[model samples]
Target: ELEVKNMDMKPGSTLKITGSIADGTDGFVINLGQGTDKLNLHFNPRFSESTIVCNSLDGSNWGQEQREDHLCFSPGSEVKFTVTFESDKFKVKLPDGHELTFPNRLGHSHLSYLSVRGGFNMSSFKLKE
Candidate 1:
């Protein structure tokens, strides 16, 4: 897992992540939070189930699960994607050029902490204003 402290991810900014899912990988999660207990966004890709789940956590309690069936990745394949933050939602561009959005349930205009976890190899991560 990787943790970035005091990230200050802002609206209109973009997060570009490039990586590869490992062989026999079950899933991976990318989280943007104020802290560990307050996740503004949880971007989870479940390979085992062939779905992507997006959710939020407040006060250590999780919100409803949002699932996307159109996946943009496969096991042991390289993937590159971008996530753009807006005031009300997150806009994601998948590796296949398809897009998806998840609501910003936490309602925060910015995020301070970022973390990446699970069975994948990260080649690069960038925050573009």
Candidate 2:
């Protein structure tokens, strides 16, 4: 588990992340938010479903999910991706050159919270603001 606060990622910022996927694991999730309760994006890559699920949180309620498929990674494999934050949405560029978009429901100028969990080991992360 990893928790990073005060990230301050804003619109036009690009967050590039590189990590290793643990062997025989189910999945991992990367969360971005203004604060805890304002969790704006939930990026969950689930090996079980072979899909990446995206969702937003409001209080304890999670909004509709957006799922992307055709992405696969072997156990212990290295994974890398970039996330671009736009004023209205978050654009994700996957390792295989595929892109996915999720709406910026909170509409905040900057987000300060991030967390990572489940089976993924991060090696490097860079934010360009």
Candidate 3:
């Protein structure tokens, strides 16, 4: 599985992956950003009082069964994501060809940090140039 092991990532960075999963599967599953310690961000709708998870590799492994919404960058799909940090929410481009806002619950601001771990192929991963 491919993974991004870093602390500081921005919007301009385009994470690209191209390959096929096993027959019963589809494409590569990615873990966006990573962190070992419990990191929390704010969760406000108007970028004022909340923080949302940028993306999670193991969505099922998330604490409290919280479904962290993610955009599906289809196989063979060239996706471009812009990173915008607000005090209350995380704004991201959807892989299904849309945009979505994820809110933070730990009660903080800033969605500029990302941490993803496990569940995806390692070959079909690339950060934008």
TM-score of each: 0.94, 0.93, 0.40
Error of 2 at 29 (Å): 0.2
The best candidate in terms of TM-score:
1
The superposed Cα distance between candidate 3 and the true structure at residue 66, in angstroms, equals 6.8
Kindly list the per-residue Cα lDDT of model 3 for residues 1-129, writing each as its tens digit: 333444343433433433332332223222333333334321111111122234332223443323343424333323444434344554554445565555443444322234322223334444442
Cα-based lDDT for every prediction: 0.87, 0.84, 0.35
Q: Model 1 over residues 25-126: C-alpha lDDT tens digits?
A: 899988887888888779899978889999999996899999999876887878887989887989889988999899998888887888888987778889
Prediction-by-prediction clash tally: 0, 0, 22
**Model 2 CA deviation exceeding 4 Å by range:** none
Off by over 4 Å in 3: 1-6, 9-73, 95-97, 108-129
- Judging by lDDT against the true structure, name the best candidate: 1
1 or 2, which is superior by lDDT?
1
* Cα shift from native, residue 36, model 1 (Å): 1.6
lDDT for model 3, please: 0.35
